[PDB]
Design a protein around this ligand. Structure first.
Ligand SMILES: [Zn+2]
Lengths: 57, 141, 141, 191, 52, 12, 75, 137, 57, 53, 127
RNA sequence: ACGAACGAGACUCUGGCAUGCUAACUAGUUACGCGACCCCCGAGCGGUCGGCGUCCCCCAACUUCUUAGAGGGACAAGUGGCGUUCAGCCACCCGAGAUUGAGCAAUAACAGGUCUGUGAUGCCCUUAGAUGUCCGGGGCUGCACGCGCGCUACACUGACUGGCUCAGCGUGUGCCUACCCUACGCCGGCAGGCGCGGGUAACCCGUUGAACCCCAUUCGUGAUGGGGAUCGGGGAUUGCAAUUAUUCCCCAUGAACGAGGAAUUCCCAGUAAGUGCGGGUCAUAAGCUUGCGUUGAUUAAGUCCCUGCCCUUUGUACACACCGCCCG
């Protein structure tokens, strides 16, 4: 997942970006919960322009 | 035209539109008699300006008002704003400045509260509270 | 004068006087056992009820012609206290006002409005507007 | 600013000060006068404009406390002018000046706060600000007018007019006029 | 609240809709001819003698 | 549903 | 309950005192009668209307809360 | 007026001289304000007056008017007892005929074991009457 | 729809179909990349433009 | 069959199904959707309803 | 209730007609005698659920000698106006869980079976 | 330290200064042609003044008002005071003077809740005597107590009947398959029976001819006509079916209650409260939700003293952090 999310980041920065945040959840071993998160750039959170200025998925 | 004035006025939401008209001098609110909105306690209310703006300036006016909305005294300030709103342009635009001078001053000589009413209104209920600001009580065990 | 310039209440009271003494207006079918818009849980007490109620339906027809049960019982009604319940509105006596309209439509002081209803006759207008000037020139409250 | 100041039953000027220490808080000529008072509480801007808010408007707006009774406001003002008329009839002279002097004579003087010297809750007396004084007088005479027409026969206006009679024109004849001595003697011994 | 709640919550869902109406006295065809500039944005265009 | 231990004869 | 015993119906001696004593002040009200002398309120209404019949007083107020009847040196 | 009468003797039942004619005739078994006004209108007896000075002439009139409504037909839906469980007829009942009839109906239910006739064995309100912590006086 | 209803429920039906087809196409045709769709309604027409990284799907 | 079907379904609140999850714990027919609000907050960006209060 | 002056003269004259003329009566007067709720149940029919019963009711009354009682007919249901001919029977209703036998009394007729047979089965209590 | 963001300001809605802008025969108007109908209505019983939700057929007309697009307010802007005139703050003239409230939506995570919104979902489980399935009756609503969320009040500013004084919220005809918003007269009292009709909605209800403020009226401080249940006797009304009253209506039953001691919430402004009305559930439908809306109040412009965020100094055996270790 990490070496694939690095690729996601690499491809979006190839096509030119200003900030992104990719978060994955789930246990990568056993019984105790884990999640991981990647962030860079500018990523506005509040206000209205999130939905139409980052194309969340 | 150039001979009468038909413009609006209102309290928070109760809206009247008053038309001062050249003629013999008559007053009519709602297309009904002046006092006879009949709060039957505020019989005193809507003749304070009528007897303090100039009985002479209540000699040529044929007031007809078209009204709707809200509550009773709210509509009373609707008409009380509307009639002044019409007569002020009745005096300034069509007519000279000396005729204006008396009633423009009598505006605040009663009160400035009439040219524009409250910038206030009741607003949306906010949930978790039974009104606009209160809150539903916080219980325990 | 116009029937607006008389007091609204005394207009209908003396309308009931005129029609009562003329005896034509429907005399009661049962005086105190009428529930009268069962939001009025109690009863009407004096046999001068139908005179006033029919007179007032006539006056509301003057206010606007061609009315009906749904649109007159709405204003005739009011508030009720509902024991162990809150207050809703469900207008009551329908045939009382219907019999009002019948007892005057056979009397040709209220006439058929277009496509439905009970509209106004020149005869009803003239009679009520004479009684208006009568009452207005007499004393008032 | 009118050519004559009248109620349709008696005059509206001829209001003065009795105990100067309350000047500019009892208000009768702020900027106008009316046929009969009515307001939203528009003077709610600060403490000062409600300090110098008119007295007749003050009492007429204040007399609606016990909940749903501001939900009957026209008839309540009918009551207030009724009570002023009852004073005018029983005791004669103009009820507004008499209520002015009655508020004066039934104003408190001092209030004692809770500052424990070594831990035990004591009291300490500070001079009542004249505005709080006049408001205690009016807004405890209103409390008395409710306690009367609640547990008596007399109606609201009759109770209020009796209180405005016997406040300035009688001693120990008001719930307010006993609150007054209670507060002042508390202030004395609790200095 | 999907299902995880501790208190009362009430969201809202609001929309923007409209009905905007021209009213012209021409035959059924010259209106077709004069009108070709409304099918550039997305707004449902319905031309009828009487109401649609 | 079929809370019961008998559903006597579903057999044809 | 512990009641004022305001006399409940029309009363001979009180009827005389009402008829020739009451319309004399500048304040009159059925409750005023029922707490100055002893009477029920509608009873005071009836004796007050009996004195109004002669017309020994000038009115000031007219309300459901109360009405005020004031002295004209008549009574 | 000057008191014609005092404490009265009605239907073999004593009443309130405290309230007026109608609103003290409501102090009778089977009567209300509504029944009081209706019966007095049917009997043509005064309202503006009071029962404490109302004459036993116009008390016995009223008694004989309420006792047998069918002679005057105050409408039967206005007449409490109706379409009952045995030998149905139409009339109104008052002083202790109500106790007699409510009694008899109650023994019918008590003997027959209806749900209400058993919740009077359980001492509660027939319906719907939550009673877990709620509504027990 | 076939019952000639008001503009309220008509616009609502339009949105109901946008919804009822979005996840259909996403969970049907995602044997490729997936970007989105865009619908619009014109006189005697209704055109839907599908947008994805394989024109051939 | 003499035992199988005798019930046309025209009653109550769960008569007509939520289209997406069809879970019957309370449904609604304001605009004929008959679909949960836990469903509608997920698909109203495609229905047309988007919060702007 | 009711003492018919026993040893003679059955008399359950509800609403003002007699039982010895009401056992052999007609649905019109029966409906105008039954209360508004019974009438309201009857103004949509006593459908097959009770026809399939009444046939067995008559079968039982004929087969079992009147010097005995007719057989116990069991209803899965709880709501039924006691008709004129089912005076004097013994019938076991289903309360939803258990068969409870109910004795037709001549002073039941004109109500619903689910009031004579209830289902909040008498609770045991505690503190 | 510099050059950087996200969270705040920004991103929107709502209410408010708009007497100037933009036009709707599917909206209103209509000021104009009291013209056609109307009364003489009135002093007068005439000229005319007053009132018609009365119409004009429409190929007259405009958006004062009217639903509102853009144009455009407001930024301590000026100045009277303070600072260091730094970023700003109180006030007044221009008045809308900042900021009307509603929204929008972080990083670490709790192991708080979501598998009984799901075919979101891994294990194992039920797998023909089912936890899959259609159905019938009962149960989710049984009462000796405790608690909270709660509607109605404890009556005189009670309030009873009758008049007339006064809207916007929104849904509104078959659906993803069964029942859409209204009005007229004929009957019984209301409930309730009857059929003709407006409408896919500025067309139509509805100029929502909305209540509590209003007033006439009353007996009379009297568990009192109140606060008004309980239960009795019926009437209709949907439904395959209301029986432990699901709802509606009456006669009538007439009760527990006198502003409540144990703890605590809420709001300092069209805001509390009083509060009729809408909308979600439906074959039945609100004391709930959450909005519309009115009549609109007591004092308050300070302070962390009580419960509480953030800051700095700063001790710590605490590293799941004071509900922690901990000692005889
Ligand atoms: Zn769903």
């Amino acid at each position: 997942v990490r070496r694939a999310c690095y690729g996601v980041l690499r491809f979006i920065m190839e096509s030119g970006a200003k900030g992104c945040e990719v978060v994955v959840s789930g246990k990568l071993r056993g019984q105790r919960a884990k999640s991981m998160k990647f962030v860079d750039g500018l990523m506005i959170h509040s206000g209205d322009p999130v939905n139409y200025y980052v194309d969340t998925a | 035209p150039l001979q009468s004035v038909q413009v609006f006025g209102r309290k928070k939401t109760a809206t009247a539109v008053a038309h001062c008209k050249r003629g013999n001098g008559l007053i009519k609110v709602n297309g009904r008699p002046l006092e006879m909105i009949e709060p039957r306690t505020l019989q005193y209310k809507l003749l304070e300006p009528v007897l303090l703006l100039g009985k002479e300036r209540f000699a040529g006016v044929d007031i007809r008002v078209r009204v709707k909305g809200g509550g009773h005294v709210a509509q009373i300030y609707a008409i009380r704003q509307s009639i002044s709103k019409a007569l002020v342009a009745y005096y300034q635009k069509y007519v000279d400045e000396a005729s204006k001078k008396e009633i423009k001053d009598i505006l605040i000589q009663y009160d400035r509260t009439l040219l524009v009413a409250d910038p206030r209104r009741c607003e949306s209920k906010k949930f978790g509270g039974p009104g606009a600001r209160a809150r539903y009580q916080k219980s325990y065990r | 004068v116009t029937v607006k310039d008389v007091n609204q209440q005394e207009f209908v009271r003396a309308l009931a006087a005129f029609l009562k003494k003329s005896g034509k207006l429907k005399v009661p079918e049962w005086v105190d056992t009428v529930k009268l818009a069962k939001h009025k849980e109690l009863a009407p007490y004096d046999e001068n009820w139908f005179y006033t109620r029919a007179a007032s339906t006539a006056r509301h027809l003057y206010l606007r012609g061609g009315a009906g049960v749904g649109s007159m019982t709405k204003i005739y009604g009011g508030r009720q206290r509902n024991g162990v319940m809150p207050s809703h509105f469900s207008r009551g006596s329908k045939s009382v006002a219907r019999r009002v309209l019948q007892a005057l439509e056979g009397l040709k002081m209220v006439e058929k409005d277009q496509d439905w209803g009970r509209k106004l006759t020149p005869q009803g207008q003239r009679d009520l507007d004479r009684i208006a000037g009568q009452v207005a020139a007499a004393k008032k409250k | 600013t009118p050519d004559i100041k009248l109620f349709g039953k008696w005059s509206t000027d001829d209001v003065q000060i009795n105990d100067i220490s309350l000047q500019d808080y009892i208000a009768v000529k702020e900027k106008y006068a009316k046929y009969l008072p009515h307001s939203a509480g528009r003077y709610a801007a600060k403490r000062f404009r409600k300090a110098q808010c008119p007295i007749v408007e003050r009492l007429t707006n204040s007399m609606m406390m016990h909940g749903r009774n501001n939900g009957k406001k026209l008839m309540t003002v009918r009551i207030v002018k009724h009570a002023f008329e009852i004073i005018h009839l029983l005791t004669g002279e103009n009820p507004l000046q008499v209520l002015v002097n009655a508020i004066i004579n039934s104003g408190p003087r001092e209030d004692s706060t809770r500052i424990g010297r070594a831990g035990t809750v004591r009291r300490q007396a500070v001079d009542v600000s004249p505005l709080r004084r006049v408001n205690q007088a009016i807004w405890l005479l209103c409390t008395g007018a409710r306690e009367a027409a609640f547990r008596n026969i007399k109606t609201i206006a009759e109770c209020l007019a009796d209180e405005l009679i016997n406040a300035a024109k009688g001693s120990s004849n008001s719930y307010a006029i006993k609150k007054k001595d209670e507060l002042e003697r508390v202030a004395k011994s609790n200095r | 609240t999907p299902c995880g709640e501790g208190s009362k919550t009430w969201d809202r869902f609001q929309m923007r809709i409209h009905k905007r109406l021209i009213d012209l006295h021409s035959p059924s065809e010259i209106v077709k001819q004069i009108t070709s500039i409304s099918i550039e944005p997305g707004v449902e265009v319905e031309v009828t003698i009487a109401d649609a | 549903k079929s809370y019961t231990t008998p559903k006597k004869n579903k057999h044809k | 309950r512990d009641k004022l015993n305001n006399l409940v119906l029309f009363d001979k001696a009180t009827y005389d005192k009402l008829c020739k004593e009451v319309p004399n002040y500048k304040l009159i009200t059925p409750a005023v009668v029922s707490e100055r002398l002893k009477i029920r309120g509608s009873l005071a209404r009836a004796a007050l209307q009996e004195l109004l019949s002669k017309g020994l007083i000038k009115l000031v107020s007219k309300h459901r809360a109360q009405v005020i009847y004031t002295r004209n040196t008549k009574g | 007026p000057e008191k014609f009468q005092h404490i009265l003797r009605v239907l073999n039942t004593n009443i309130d001289g405290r309230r007026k004619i109608a609103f003290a005739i409501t102090a009778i078994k089977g009567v209300g304000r509504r029944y009081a006004h209706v019966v007095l209108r049917k009997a043509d007896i005064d309202l503006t007056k009071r029962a404490g000075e109302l004459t036993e002439d116009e008390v016995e009139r009223v008694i004989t008017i309420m006792q047998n409504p069918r002679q005057y037909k105050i409408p039967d839906w206005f007449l409490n007892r109706q379409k009952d469980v045995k030998d149905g007829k139409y009339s109104q009942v008052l002083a202790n005929g109500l106790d007699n009839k409510l009694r008899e109906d109650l023994e019918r239910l008590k003997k027959i074991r209806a749900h209400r006739g058993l919740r009077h064995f359980w001492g509660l309100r027939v319906r719907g009457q939550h009673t877990k912590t709620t509504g027990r006086r | 729809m076939a019952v000639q209803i008001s503009k309220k429920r008509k616009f609502v039906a339009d949105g109901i179909f946008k919804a009822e087809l979005n996840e259909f196409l996403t969970r049907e045709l995602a044997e490729d990349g997936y970007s989105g769709v865009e619908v619009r309604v014109t006189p005697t027409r209704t055109e839907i433009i599908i947008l994805a990284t394989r024109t051939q799907n | 069959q003499q035992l199988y079907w005798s019930h046309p379904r025209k009653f109550g609140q769960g008569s007509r199904s939520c289209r997406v999850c069809s879970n019957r714990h309370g449904l609604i027919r304001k605009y004929g959707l008959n679909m949960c609000r836990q469903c509608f907050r997920q698909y109203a960006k495609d229905i047309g309803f988007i919060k702007l209060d | 209730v009711e003492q018919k002056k026993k040893r003679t003269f059955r008399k359950f004259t509800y609403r003002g007609v007699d039982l010895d003329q009401l056992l052999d009566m007609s649905y019109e007067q029966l409906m105008q005698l039954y209360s508004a709720r019974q009438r309201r149940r009857l103004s949509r029919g006593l459908r097959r659920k009770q026809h399939s019963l009444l046939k067995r009711l008559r079968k039982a009354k004929k087969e079992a000698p009147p010097m005995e009682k007719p057989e116990v007919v069991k209803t899965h249901l709880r709501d039924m106006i006691i008709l004129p001919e089912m005076v004097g029977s013994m019938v076991g209703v289903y309360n939803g869980k258990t068969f409870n036998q109910v004795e037709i009394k001549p002073e039941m007729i004109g109500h619903y079976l689910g009031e004579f047979s209830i289902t909040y089965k008498p609770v045991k209590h505690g503190r």
